[PDB]
Amino acid sequence: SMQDPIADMLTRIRNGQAANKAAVTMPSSKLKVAIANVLKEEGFIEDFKVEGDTKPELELTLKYFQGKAVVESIQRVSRPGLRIYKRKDELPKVMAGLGIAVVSTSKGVMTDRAARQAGLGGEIICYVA
Amino acid sequence: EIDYKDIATLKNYITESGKIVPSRITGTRAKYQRQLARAIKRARYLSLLPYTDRH
Amino acid sequence: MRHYEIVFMVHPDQSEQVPGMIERYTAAITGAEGKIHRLEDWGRRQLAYPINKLHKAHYVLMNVEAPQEVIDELETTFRFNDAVIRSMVMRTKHAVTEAS
Amino acid sequence: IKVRENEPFDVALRRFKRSCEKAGVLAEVRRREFYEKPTTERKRAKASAVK
Amino acid sequence: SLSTEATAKIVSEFGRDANDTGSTEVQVALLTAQINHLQGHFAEHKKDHHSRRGLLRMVSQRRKLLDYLKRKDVARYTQLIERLGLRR
RNA sequence: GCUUGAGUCUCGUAGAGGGGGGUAGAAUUCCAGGUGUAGCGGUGAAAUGCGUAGAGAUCUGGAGGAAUACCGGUGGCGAAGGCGGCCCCCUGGACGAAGACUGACGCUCAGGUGCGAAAGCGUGGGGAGCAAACAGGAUUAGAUACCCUGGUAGUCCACGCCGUAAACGAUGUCGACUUGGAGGUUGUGCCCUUGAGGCGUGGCUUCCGGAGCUAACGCGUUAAGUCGACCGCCUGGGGAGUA
Ligand SMILES: [Mg+2]
Ligand SMILES: [Mg+2]
Ligand SMILES: [Mg+2]
Ligand SMILES: [Mg+2]
Ligand SMILES: [Mg+2]
Ligand SMILES: [Mg+2]
Ligand SMILES: [Mg+2]
Ligand SMILES: [Mg+2]
Ligand SMILES: [Mg+2]
Ligand SMILES: [Mg+2]
Ligand SMILES: [Mg+2]
Ligand SMILES: [Mg+2]
Ligand SMILES: [Mg+2]
Ligand SMILES: [Mg+2]
């Protein structure tokens, strides 16, 4: 039933945001991390944090610009039920460039901007603008 | 309440008629209005209290 | 071993068999190594309504700890026995003493 | 139900009858069975009695 | 719903020490135990349809836990059904 | 391999949850009798009906079946159906408090299986009241009705069929996330127990209401919001849930 953790992230964000909530926690995982990264790196959140050893715990800081939140739309794209895989030449580009698409390649979890540069393809985890 | 044998405490939870008295009058709690009835019933079966003012 | 409250009412004319009755039911319960945590020969008491015709009746309260077996036979002998015009073996939840 | 009412007063003084029986449980039992519809009937005795 | 006495005895009989309460093997026997008991309950009565649900439940459970063990340690598995007496 | 998902263990708590057996009081009908005397009963009004073989009314003693007033409550329990006197026996689930074991053993599920209101069917039983059918009396232009006097199946038990309901919250199951307010219910920690309490912390539930959603009505932390897993199902009305 907790069969898609990444959607639970994408959404814990999405909601917390719409609730002008500053913080946000959840159980962590290598995969969760690598994404929190791209989200920080590409600048949709302040910064992340994992507090614990036995039962690790991702913690994210939400950015808010004007009254609005910085994340206008976080949406899963692949998922358990129906997985997605674009090559390199068929990688998506969100909002015509603005915003981005997380994607996991054989060389780690990058953005579309990245993977295009990297010249390769992967599973398009989710979209974020 | 604590018991049916308490015909004493009991007799002030029924009308002249013998009819159990609503909780909305007694102000009794919930849990206890049940304990109460179930003990008045017991008292009634054991001829320790009338079902009726007919007797 | 389960406790029960228990209390029966003997017919007035058959009052005098109450001593032996208690004697009997006790030897019956203790017989199967069951304790007898209370006993109260309430004697002739007056009844709230008449029952079987006839008012007043001998009462006997009696809390006990005994197997669900001697409890059975008890319930039936209360039938076999005409002299007992009501009985009621009750709850349980640990012994009790004095009250009334 | 019952009234002693000893010496001084020929007034009935039985307003107790408007405290239980009468159109109480006697208008109730008087007719159509009901069965599950009292459920609905009493669901207005509270859809009202909320305020 | 199965005496503390007996329930304990079986933990003791199937798992490591008492306290190894949730050992696969032990649940299976703890259920098995109750299931079998219950046969006489539903012998008489039979119309007790509700309680019957709980019993079927018991078996859906055991059946699942048994399947799990088998995937783990088929050795522990075989021993178990010989020991309880089921599968035929 | 891990321990938080899920299980197991200890102790308790609430409960019309289920199955079996006993048992109570109030009423009705009926049988027998006391007293009593010409009406009762029924309607909108009537009549059929009942009463001088003494009715109804009243008192008493019986028999029988059916259902359990008050409690009783936007109270409670169950998966749905549905479950209300009281007691015992058998038994399912739920919940809470400690820690302890198992170590992903889970979620969903076509097919399959089980359950499943009332009516209905089969065999025996049972039968007070109610009541399709049917009979009589009225109403009405007509009255195969609504009303009245009767009343059979059935409504009751056992055993077995049937498998449907507006079987509805007309809202599939599970999981995570997202401002509040006033209750009801039911656990549990703490506090001069010094109050019939004070502050917490669970499960369940009723009423409002915010974002959000909605065609609108409305839903709104018990979602119809935000998201995922799986299943069922829809594709104009009639024809037809028929051939
Ligand atoms: Mg994963
Ligand atoms: Mg009678
Ligand atoms: Mg009589
Ligand atoms: Mg239980
Ligand atoms: Mg069936
Ligand atoms: Mg039927
Ligand atoms: Mg039949
Ligand atoms: Mg008729
Ligand atoms: Mg249908
Ligand atoms: Mg409904
Ligand atoms: Mg609220
Ligand atoms: Mg609302
Ligand atoms: Mg939803
Ligand atoms: Mg057809």
Residue B25's alpha-carbon distances to A65, B13, D19, D48, D50, in angstroms, are 60, 9, 13, 19, 17
CA distance D7 to A73: 88
What residues pair up with E63 in beta bridges, in sequence order? none
Report helix angle E49-72 to E24-43, nearest 10: 150
The count of structural domains within chain E is 1
Tell me A107's DSSP state: T
Which experimental method was this entry solved with? X-ray
Q: CA D30, C1' F30: Å apart?
A: 22
Instruction: State whether the beta carbon of B27 lies below 7 angstroms from any atom of strand F.
Output: no
Residue E12's alpha-carbon distances to C40, E16, E26, E32, in angstroms, are 45, 7, 9, 15
What is the SS3 assignment for A102? Answer: strand
Q: CA D29, C1' F50: Å apart?
A: 25
How are beta strands C7-10 and A122-128 bridged, if at all?
unpaired
> Mind giving me the DSSP string for chain B?
---SS-HHHHGGGB-TT-PBPPHHHH---HHHHHHHHHHHHHHHHTTSS-S-TT-
CA distance A125 to A110: 10
- Where do runs of H (alpha helix) occur along D1-51? 25-29, 38-42
Listed by start position, the domains of chain A span: 1-71, 72-129
Report helix angle E74-84 to E24-43, nearest 10: 30
With CA atoms as reference, the chain D residue closest to B20 would be D20
Q: Provide the residue type at E77 as one letter.
A: Y
| Cα R_g (chain B), whole angstroms | 10
CA torsion sign for C41, C43, C48, C53 is positive
Ramachandran region, residue E74 (left: φ > 0; alpha: ψ -120 to 50; beta: rest): alpha
Q: Which two tokens stand for residue B2?
A: 């604590």
Q: Provide the residue type at B48 as one letter.
A: L
Query: Whose CA is closest to C100, among B44, B50, B6, B38?
Result: B6
Listed by start position, the domains of chain C span: 1-92
Q: What is the CATH number of the domain that holds E80?
A: 1.10.287.10
Query: Whose CA is closest to C81, among C5, C1, C3, C21?
Result: C21
Q: Provide the residue type at A20 as one letter.
A: N
Q: Is B53 on the interface with C (CB under 8 A)?
A: no
Using a CB-CB cut-off of 8 Å, the residues of chain D touching B53 are: 1-2
CA distance A120 to E32: 56
CA distance A56 to A30: 10
Using a CB-CB cut-off of 8 Å, the residues of chain B touching D20 are: 15, 17, 19
Order across the sheet with A74-76: list the strands: A74-76, A122-128, A100-105, A108-111
Q: Provide the residue type at B22 as one letter.
A: P
CA distance C69 to C56: 31
Instruction: State whether the beta carbon of E73 lies below 7 angstroms from any atom of strand F.
Output: no
Range of the domain at E7: 1-88
* Residues in CB range of C36: below 8 A, 6 or more apart: C26, C29, C30, C62, C63, C64, C65
Resolution of the deposited coordinates, in angstroms?
Answer: 2.9
Using a CB-CB cut-off of 8 Å, the residues of chain B touching C47 are: 47
Backbone angles phi, psi at B36, to 5 degrees: -70, -60
Query: Whose CA is closest to C95, among C25, C55, C38?
Result: C38
Q: Output the CA E56–ligand 5 centroid distance in Å.
A: 16
CA distance A113 to B21: 77
Tell me C53's DSSP state: S
Query: Whose CA is closest to A56, among A21, A23, A31?
Result: A31
CATH number of A1-71: 3.30.1370.30
Nucleotides of chain F in contact with protein CB (under 7 A) are 2-11, 13-20, 22-27, 61-62, 69-75, 78-81, 85-93, 100-107, 114-116, 130, 159-160, 174-179, 184-187, 206-207, 210-211, 225-230
Using a CB-CB cut-off of 8 Å, the residues of chain C touching B54 are: 49
Q: Output the CA C70–ligand 5 centroid distance in Å.
A: 40
CA distance B42 to C34: 26
Q: CA D39, C1' F162: Å apart?
A: 29
Fold of the domain spanning A72-129: Dna Ligase; domain 1 (3.30.1490)
* Residues in CB range of D20: below 8 A, 6 or more apart: B15, B17, B19, D1
Residue D48's alpha-carbon distances to A57, B22, D23, in angstroms, are 51, 19, 21
* Residues in CB range of C41: below 8 A, 6 or more apart: C18, C22, C59, C60
With CA atoms as reference, the chain D residue closest to B16 would be D1
Q: CA E51, C1' F158: Å apart?
A: 21
| Number of C-beta neighbours around residue C3 at 10 A | 20
Q: Output the CA D31–ligand 7 centroid distance in Å.
A: 28
The verdict on a CB contact (< 8 Å) between C61 and B5 is yes
What residues pair up with C40 in beta bridges, in sequence order? C61
Which B residues in the span 1-20 are in contact with D, Cβ-Cβ below 8 Å?
A: 15-17, 19
Closest CB to C88 among B45, B52, B54 = B45
Within its chain, how far is the Cα of E45 from the centroid? 23
Q: Which residue has the tokens 């012998």?
A: E43
Query: Whose CA is closest to B1, among B40, B27, B30?
Result: B40
Q: Which two tokens stand for residue E43?
A: 């012998």
